[PDB]
């Protein structure tokens, strides 16, 4: 398939601005939800499900089309707890029903990271409504009871190496697994983006345990937890070096995320030549709002 990213008609950056401050004016406001995470990582959560749908063999899948708003991925196992992001979202969208709908779900991830302290992703808009025909089936996203080599294999599908597998991990920093969204059992939680994630997976004593669920999770007496897919991170001697490059240097973490981040939301999508460039969106903080 081919999917050319198509304006909003007449929009322009100050109108994106506009949508990123009225989603980090709500984020901000909406301060209790999830024990005082705040909406920020269900955010980057819902931007990269609706995006990892993608399949760099055929085209199908991705965030263009905008297809999570369907009860078919909505309702995807995978996706349980992403409602909450997508209510969060919808009276944003009331306000801007001009933006397409793979639009507002990706610049709510952007909007997320760059409030959370994480580094500028730029954001390209365009993404375009598809009718519910167009609607991946459930199964595209990646299990977390497993290794590295599958870590390393499902990614191949969305066109990642293993710096841009290693570096979009670290939004596992962010937020916590909930035992009734996905069998993974989550205690104490941030909402700041940082490279903690490296730091973490290199410096707990980490205890294979077994979960409520019934499921192995490997946890720190710290109260740190890290799926199994996570910890592969650190047991496959690639990945592992990568790691510890990103536990070093926050800069270069901040910097690989981005371009991971981005490449992300895009894949799938044709950009014409005379298209915009990238829009890069001042925080709150930037603008003293
Ligand atoms: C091997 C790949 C991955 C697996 C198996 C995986 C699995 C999971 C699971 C099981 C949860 C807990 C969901 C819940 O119980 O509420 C989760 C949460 C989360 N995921 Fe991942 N994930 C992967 C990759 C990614 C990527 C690439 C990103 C973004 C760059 C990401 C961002 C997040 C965030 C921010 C949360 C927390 C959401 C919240 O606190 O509500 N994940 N992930």
């Known amino acids: 398939l081919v999917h050319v990213a198509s304006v909003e008609k007449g929009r322009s950056y100050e109108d994106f601005q506009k949508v990123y401050n009225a989603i980090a004016l709500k984020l901000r406001e909406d301060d209790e939800y999830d024990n005082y995470i705040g909406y920020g990582p269900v955010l980057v959560r819902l931007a990269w499900h609706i995006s990892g749908t993608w399949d760099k063999h055929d085209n199908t ?15 995807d196992p995978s996706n349980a707890g992403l409602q909450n992001g997508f209510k969060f979202l919808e009276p944003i969208h009331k306000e801007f029903p001009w933006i397409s709908s793979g639009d507002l779900f990706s610049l709510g991830g952007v909007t997320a990271v760059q409030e959370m ?20 089936d459930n199964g595209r996203l990646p299990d977390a009871d497993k290794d590295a080599g599958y870590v390393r294999t499902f990614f ?15 939004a596992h920093a962010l937020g916590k697994t909930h035992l009734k969204n996905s069998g993974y059992e989550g205690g104490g939680a941030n909402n700041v983006f940082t490279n903690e994630f490296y730091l973490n997976l290199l410096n707990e004593d980490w205890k294979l345990e077994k979960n409520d669920a019934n499921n192995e999770q490997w946890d720190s007496k710290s109260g740190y ?25 926050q800069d270069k973490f901040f910097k690989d995320f981005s ?13 014409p030549k005379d298209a915009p460039s ?7 903080e930037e603008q003293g709002l």
């Not at 899948?61 to 309702?75: A, L």
């Not at 199994?228 to 240097?249: R, W």
């Open 61 to 75: 899948g991705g965030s263009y089309g905008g297809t999570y708003r369907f009860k078919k991925e909505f309702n």
């Open 117 to 136: 302290q994480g580094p500028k992703i730029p954001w390209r808009c365009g993404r375009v409504d598809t009718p519910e025909d167009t609607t991946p």
């Open 156 to 170: 191949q599908r969305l066109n990642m190496n293993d710096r841009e597998v290693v570096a979009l991990m670290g």
């Open 225 to 249: 937890m890290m799926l199994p897919t996570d910890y592969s991170l650190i047991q496959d001697p690639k990945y592992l070096s990568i790691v510890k490059e990103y536990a070093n240097d």
């Open 259 to 271: 371009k991971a981040f981005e490449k992300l939301l895009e894949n799938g999508i044709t950009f």
């Open 278 to 284: 990238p829009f890069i969106f001042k925080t709150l």
